[PDB]
Enzyme design. Structure first.
Site, PDB file in Angstrom:
ATOM      1  N   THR A  11       0.805  -1.216   0.000  1.00  0.00           N
ATOM      2  CA  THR A  11       0.000   0.000   0.000  1.00  0.00           C
ATOM      3  C   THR A  11       0.840   1.269   0.000  1.00  0.00           C
ATOM      4  OG1 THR A  11      -0.289  -0.044   2.418  1.00  0.00           O
ATOM      5  CG2 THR A  11      -1.945  -1.117   1.077  1.00  0.00           C
ATOM      6  N   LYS A  43      -5.384   2.260   3.773  1.00  0.00           N
ATOM      7  CA  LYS A  43      -4.742   0.992   3.486  1.00  0.00           C
ATOM      8  C   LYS A  43      -5.774  -0.091   3.223  1.00  0.00           C
ATOM      9  CE  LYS A  43      -0.258   1.484   5.519  1.00  0.00           C
ATOM     10  NZ  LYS A  43       0.114   2.784   6.131  1.00  0.00           N
ATOM     11  N   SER A  83      10.236   1.647   2.469  1.00  0.00           N
ATOM     12  CA  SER A  83      10.546   2.806   3.338  1.00  0.00           C
ATOM     13  C   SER A  83       9.331   3.435   4.056  1.00  0.00           C
ATOM     14  CB  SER A  83      11.248   3.892   2.547  1.00  0.00           C
ATOM     15  OG  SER A  83      10.276   4.803   2.082  1.00  0.00           O
ATOM     16  N   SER A 107      13.902  -3.897  -1.285  1.00  0.00           N
ATOM     17  CA  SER A 107      13.333  -2.559  -1.435  1.00  0.00           C
ATOM     18  C   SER A 107      14.440  -1.592  -1.811  1.00  0.00           C
ATOM     19  CB  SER A 107      12.619  -2.124  -0.164  1.00  0.00           C
ATOM     20  OG  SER A 107      11.940  -0.893  -0.372  1.00  0.00           O
ATOM     21  N   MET A 111      18.850   5.595  -5.473  1.00  0.00           N
ATOM     22  CA  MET A 111      20.278   5.563  -5.769  1.00  0.00           C
ATOM     23  C   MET A 111      20.825   4.208  -5.368  1.00  0.00           C
ATOM     24  SD  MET A 111      20.871   9.037  -3.692  1.00  0.00           S
ATOM     25  CE  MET A 111      22.598   8.730  -3.794  1.00  0.00           C
ATOM     26  N   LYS A 124      20.224  -0.634   3.378  1.00  0.00           N
ATOM     27  CA  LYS A 124      19.993  -1.463   2.204  1.00  0.00           C
ATOM     28  C   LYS A 124      21.155  -2.413   1.968  1.00  0.00           C
ATOM     29  CE  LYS A 124      16.920   1.674  -0.255  1.00  0.00           C
ATOM     30  NZ  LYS A 124      16.724   2.620  -1.378  1.00  0.00           N
ATOM     31  N   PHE A 146      12.258   9.359  -8.824  1.00  0.00           N
ATOM     32  CA  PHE A 146      10.804   9.341  -8.990  1.00  0.00           C
ATOM     33  C   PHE A 146      10.321  10.663  -9.587  1.00  0.00           C
ATOM     34  CE2 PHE A 146       9.488   5.993  -5.598  1.00  0.00           C
ATOM     35  CZ  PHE A 146      10.479   5.152  -6.024  1.00  0.00           C
ATOM     36  N   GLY A 158       9.857  21.116  -0.870  1.00  0.00           N
ATOM     37  CA  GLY A 158       8.681  21.532  -0.147  1.00  0.00           C
ATOM     38  C   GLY A 158       7.413  21.574  -0.959  1.00  0.00           C
TER      39      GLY A 158
HETATM   40  N1  LIG Z   1      13.185   9.223  -6.544  1.00  0.00           N
HETATM   41  C1  LIG Z   1      13.711   8.487  -5.472  1.00  0.00           C
HETATM   42  O1  LIG Z   1      14.887   8.432  -5.218  1.00  0.00           O
HETATM   43  C2  LIG Z   1      12.692   7.772  -4.603  1.00  0.00           C
HETATM   44  C3  LIG Z   1      13.056   6.374  -4.172  1.00  0.00           C
HETATM   45  N2  LIG Z   1      12.180   5.678  -3.302  1.00  0.00           N
HETATM   46  C4  LIG Z   1      12.376   4.285  -2.920  1.00  0.00           C
HETATM   47  O2  LIG Z   1      10.910   3.559  -2.822  1.00  0.00           O
HETATM   48  C5  LIG Z   1      11.127   2.465  -2.184  1.00  0.00           C
HETATM   49  C6  LIG Z   1       9.765   2.149  -1.480  1.00  0.00           C
HETATM   50  O3  LIG Z   1       9.332   3.389  -0.931  1.00  0.00           O
HETATM   51  P1  LIG Z   1       7.840   4.110  -1.293  1.00  0.00           P
HETATM   52  O4  LIG Z   1       7.349   3.605  -2.628  1.00  0.00           O
HETATM   53  O5  LIG Z   1       7.992   5.635  -1.467  1.00  0.00           O
HETATM   54  O6  LIG Z   1       6.585   3.781  -0.320  1.00  0.00           O
HETATM   55  P2  LIG Z   1       6.086   4.096   1.231  1.00  0.00           P
HETATM   56  O7  LIG Z   1       7.136   4.792   2.079  1.00  0.00           O
HETATM   57  O8  LIG Z   1       4.828   4.952   1.062  1.00  0.00           O
HETATM   58  O9  LIG Z   1       5.912   2.556   1.880  1.00  0.00           O
HETATM   59  C7  LIG Z   1       4.741   2.400   2.635  1.00  0.00           C
HETATM   60  C8  LIG Z   1       4.615   0.880   3.010  1.00  0.00           C
HETATM   61  O10 LIG Z   1       5.678   0.463   3.635  1.00  0.00           O
HETATM   62  C9  LIG Z   1       5.153  -0.586   4.744  1.00  0.00           C
HETATM   63  N3  LIG Z   1       5.905  -0.148   5.905  1.00  0.00           N
HETATM   64  C10 LIG Z   1       6.609   0.964   6.229  1.00  0.00           C
HETATM   65  N4  LIG Z   1       7.162   0.771   7.452  1.00  0.00           N
HETATM   66  C11 LIG Z   1       6.839  -0.469   7.877  1.00  0.00           C
HETATM   67  C12 LIG Z   1       7.153  -1.150   9.036  1.00  0.00           C
HETATM   68  N5  LIG Z   1       7.953  -0.783  10.224  1.00  0.00           N
HETATM   69  N6  LIG Z   1       6.691  -2.380   9.243  1.00  0.00           N
HETATM   70  C13 LIG Z   1       5.920  -2.992   8.283  1.00  0.00           C
HETATM   71  N7  LIG Z   1       5.600  -2.315   7.132  1.00  0.00           N
HETATM   72  C14 LIG Z   1       6.061  -1.048   6.927  1.00  0.00           C
HETATM   73  C15 LIG Z   1       3.856  -0.530   4.792  1.00  0.00           C
HETATM   74  O11 LIG Z   1       3.393  -1.549   3.841  1.00  0.00           O
HETATM   75  P3  LIG Z   1       1.809  -2.097   3.832  1.00  0.00           P
HETATM   76  O12 LIG Z   1       1.124  -1.482   2.568  1.00  0.00           O
HETATM   77  O13 LIG Z   1       1.770  -3.643   3.753  1.00  0.00           O
HETATM   78  O14 LIG Z   1       1.193  -1.592   5.157  1.00  0.00           O
HETATM   79  C16 LIG Z   1       3.527   0.775   4.075  1.00  0.00           C
HETATM   80  O15 LIG Z   1       2.294   0.667   3.476  1.00  0.00           O
HETATM   81  C17 LIG Z   1      12.274   2.857  -1.217  1.00  0.00           C
HETATM   82  O16 LIG Z   1      13.230   1.892  -1.324  1.00  0.00           O
HETATM   83  C18 LIG Z   1      12.816   4.230  -1.697  1.00  0.00           C
HETATM   84  O17 LIG Z   1      14.327   4.275  -1.641  1.00  0.00           O
HETATM   85  C19 LIG Z   1      11.063   6.428  -2.783  1.00  0.00           C
HETATM   86  C20 LIG Z   1      11.206   7.951  -2.537  1.00  0.00           C
HETATM   87  C21 LIG Z   1      11.886   8.736  -3.714  1.00  0.00           C
END
Ligand SMILES: NC(=O)C1=CN([C@@H]2O[C@H](COP(=O)(O)OP(=O)(O)OC[C@H]3O[C@@H](n4cnc5c(N)ncnc54)[C@H](OP(=O)(O)O)[C@@H]3O)[C@@H](O)[C@H]2O)C=CC1
Ligand SMILES: NC(=O)C1=CN([C@@H]2O[C@H](COP(=O)(O)OP(=O)(O)OC[C@H]3O[C@@H](n4cnc5c(N)ncnc54)[C@H](OP(=O)(O)O)[C@@H]3O)[C@@H](O)[C@H]2O)C=CC1
Lengths: 292, 292
Positions: A11, A43, A83, A107, A111, A124, A146, A158
């Site tokens: 989610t 969710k 994350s 995950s 970078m 990671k 992204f 921001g």
């Molecule tokens: N342009 C860039 O550089 C970007 C890169 N990324 C990368 O995206 C990848 C995934 O991130 P993103 O898509 O943004 O999504 P989110 O940060 O929105 O991930 C949310 C999901 O992570 C689960 N979650 C978070 N913490 C926990 C925890 N302690 N325990 C269990 N589940 C947890 C939950 O899954 P559930 O749905 O099952 O509840 C939650 O729904 C990262 O590796 C990040 O590096 C993202 C930001 C910018």
């Protein structure tokens, strides 16, 4: 004869797109349903909306090793997009005992942490070492901005939409960055996870026409609006006044000042747009049109 | 020829459904774009996804009175879905100065606050300002959102059905109105330019979704084939609202112990399913199937 994929973190921003891309790609798609989601209307409605698209839900908890084992036994491939990066270590333990997983994509989707040398990268790499110590075949999907966090806002901070008059340029804004629609990162992931050519490989998401400087991106938008923006250049020194989310900044610095996304070549056998040329990835002039 | 509708609160749980119902009904649909949304990746992509479906965005802020006036001057009808309920008072001031608005539907949708803790005072205070300004209105009331009361069999602290145990309130033979939020939205979209409901309260009381809690539980038991272990909570036991978040309780009390959603009959000229019999509303046996 469909590959069976479990999506962990289904989610989240990246997670929900990976779920849909797995469905779209014809996989038999399973989504991990965690108990904490029971109190989150957002969710809950997302998870159950996957069911209507043909996915299956598997209830498990990271604090219940046996429910993880039991979940991963039902599939052939696992993708996580979290994350809470280090909760993946419990996933690795489960995958190791289950014994039946053909590939784990952890995950990544940012970078390449193996090219740095902050604690995002450490964690990671800690997950990677465990994947490899356990002998779990893997694929690491890396190397992109992204579009939603860096393109839709012309790389301003921001905000998530384009600015009205003024724009900050970092350096001369002539550092090459890789801007990718998250949907394409998801589609590339769904295509790579059962591709023999990428087992135990890093797959770089670097679609060629989206290798753009901040100024090229800005000029893509000026051409769409017909108005030139009021630019203000920011130097490495001024920027590095980070005096917290001092870590976001400095991820930013590596991307926009040092060119960490583009300062190394990648072969066609390890680059997603060349591996999967039938993916008509979104160019950034198309991505930005929604904001007009 | 289309009615022009401005939806306020368009990224909320109910607001997003109203946006889509208005588009699906053929309304020229506008969504308020508040500045605070600019940093929330969730709200932003919802907002801009509406544009692809034909909606337009209007930038305005509740602390900028003239931006609210500029917004409502562009539409014929305003619908608000808020839950912060008293920010609608600024909306009433703007509508009043604007002068062009043919109908205002305030953020109601739940219990009728004209019977009957501060939820009601604030809604009544919004109605009073509406009627004082002489703004024509429709008040849509009388239903339990399925997701908050039906999907969990009316248990608390969860949004999905319980596996073994269920609390029953009293005998559980008090009639309740369980309604799919999507149908509330479609009824709202059909009513906001209906000449028959101008300055009326419209009760959303679809006949076959008038059910006791025990009847809701029994629908679930027939779908699963498992009898739940039931524990009866008496009216006096329940009033151990010891924990000052406690207005959510007590609302619950009026619904489930006093039957405030069903204790007065409603005429066909003021009940949504009779006014709009072409809406094939979701019955609770169909609603609960997604959870099997
Ligand atoms: N342009 C860039 O550089 C970007 C890169 N990324 C990368 O995206 C990848 C995934 O991130 P993103 O898509 O943004 O999504 P989110 O940060 O929105 O991930 C949310 C999901 O992570 C689960 N979650 C978070 N913490 C926990 C925890 N302690 N325990 C269990 N589940 C947890 C939950 O899954 P559930 O749905 O099952 O509840 C939650 O729904 C990262 O590796 C990040 O590096 C993202 C930001 C910018
Ligand atoms: N079954 C029942 O009886 C139930 C009935 N309800 C009723 O539903 C109606 C809609 O509420 P709900 O869907 O739960 O709302 P949400 O909390 O999901 O939020 C909807 C919108 O409210 C706006 N909002 C909230 N606070 C503020 C604030 N201080 N300032 C400006 N904007 C704000 C935001 O607008 P934006 O999207 O533009 O950013 C937000 O998205 C309510 O009247 C509630 O009483 C509630 C739950 C179940």
């Amino acid at each position: 004869e469909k590959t069976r994929v479990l999506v962990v973190g289904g989610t989240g921003t990246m997670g929900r797109r990976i779920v849909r891309a797995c469905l779209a790609e014809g996989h038999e798609t399973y989504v991990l349903q965690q108990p904490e989601t029971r109190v989150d209307i957002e969710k809950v409605q997302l998870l159950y909306s996957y069911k209507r698209l043909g996915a299956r839900l598997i209830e498990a908890s990271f604090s219940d090793h046996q429910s993880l084992v039991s979940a991963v036994k039902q599939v052939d491939i696992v993708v996580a997009a979290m994350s809470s990066i280090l909760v993946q270590l419990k996933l690795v333990e489960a995958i190791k005992e289950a014994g039946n997983i053909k590939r784990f994509l952890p995950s990544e989707f940012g970078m390449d942490p193996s090219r740095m040398g902050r604690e995002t990268f450490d964690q990671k790499l800690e997950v990677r070492n465990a994947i490899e110590a356990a002998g779990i075949p893997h694929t690491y999907v890396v190397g992109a901005c992204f579009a939603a966090y860096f393109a839709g806002n012309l790389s301003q901070m921001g905000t998530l939409i384009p600015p009205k008059k003024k724009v900050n340029i970092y350096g001369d804004g002539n550092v090459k960055v890789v801007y990718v629609d998250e949907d394409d990162i998801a589609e590339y992931t769904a295509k790579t996870l059962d591709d023999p050519r990428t087992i135990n490989k890093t797959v770089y998401v670097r679609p060629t026409e989206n290798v753009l400087t901040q100024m090229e991106l800005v000029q893509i938008w000026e051409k769409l609006t017909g108005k030139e923006l009021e630019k203000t250049n920011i130097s490495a020194n001024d920027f590095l006044a980070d005096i917290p989310h001092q870590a976001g900044l400095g991820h930013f610095y590596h991307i926009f000042y040092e060119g960490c996304l583009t300062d190394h070549e990648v072969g066609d056998d390890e680059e997603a747009s060349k591996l999967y040329p039938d993916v008509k990835y979104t160019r950034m002039d198309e991505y930005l049109k929604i904001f007009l």
